[PDB]
Amino acid sequence: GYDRALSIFSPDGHIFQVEYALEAVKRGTCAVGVKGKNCVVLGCERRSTLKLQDTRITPSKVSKIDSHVVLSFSGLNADSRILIEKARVEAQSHRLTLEDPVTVEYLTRYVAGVQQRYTQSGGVR
Amino acid sequence: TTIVGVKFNNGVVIAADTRSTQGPIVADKNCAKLHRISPKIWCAGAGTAADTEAVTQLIGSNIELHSLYTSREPRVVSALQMLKQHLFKYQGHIGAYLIVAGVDPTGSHLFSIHAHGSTDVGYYLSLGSGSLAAMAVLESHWKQDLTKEEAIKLASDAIQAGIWNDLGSGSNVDVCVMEIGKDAEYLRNYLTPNVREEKQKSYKFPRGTTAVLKESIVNICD
């Protein structure tokens, strides 16, 4: 129904909504990833350290998409949940149709394609 | 199959094609469909070919026996009645549709018999697959007081229309004329329009073409 073109080009050749999403990313907690010779480490920042916060149930910054791929994020948490759900569903679908867990590259490319579609579709940011 | 019968001033003519087909395939390209029930009582058949042959031969045998018993010339009405009763007894399961014509001491006669056992009388009749074409020709060219040559031409043209405009009728035209004062005349291949052209080649194989595994002389005597 709602197909208003929200992500369009600017006279200087810029898609403003994408840059403002990047700015929203710059406002989120920090995340880092490092590759070893045979291991990968993901570190994340906790918003200061509040005392009335229940740390046993609050979602962690690192979420598993499959048994062998993990995902950290920076930016809006809700959009992260959406991307994580789509990525897990796609991982299970690839397992179902290929009888082989997905590669990190394939899942990464799927997430990137989802985001790109969201940067070129109408009625969505 | 296209069979017709036309009565002329001094007798009756019947005519038919010469095509026996096992469905859509031609089996006999010169099948004789005119059957002799009596030396002067003939019958053209359509439908189950074996049924037509068998019923004509059986009624002809019975007619010969009856003519020997009564020492009289066989009558067309007798063959008509016997064929009718026989076919009706078998509830039309004998697929034979006949046009029976002839000359007897009572004069000239032409009838048609439907396989379920019904009979019709008329001066011109037609039956078979291509019956419609022949009947159209008859209704177009028939008149009262036909001569011998006129009725012959009419029947031949009806059979020709059946041959040309029906897939179930073809090859050559057979005719049988029966006049009162003469003997019956059975013209086989009265018209031979469908003659095959010369083949573009001769496929006589060079001897030794076929490979043989074993030979043997067969003993036919004793």
């Binding site: 197909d3 073109a5 369009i8 070129q120 109408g122 | -």
Partner: protein
Amino acid sequence: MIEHARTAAVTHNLYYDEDINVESLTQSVCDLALRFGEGAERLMSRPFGVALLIAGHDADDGYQLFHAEPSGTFYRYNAKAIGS
């Protein structure tokens, strides 16, 4: 765009048992360029932000190099540079 090209190529094989002409592939790719706007079949919001150099070879027009823009227009260059 690349996906739409690749499938199209293979589809032209499946439908015709032969390789698709370079110009035909480039034209099929360009057919997506101006498939944008509002209204609505729903179309994308913005045109593409990438230009393409499509190089290939067929037995009809030999070796070919094409420039494809989000304007729906494509040219054939003996040599072409795009970017900065």
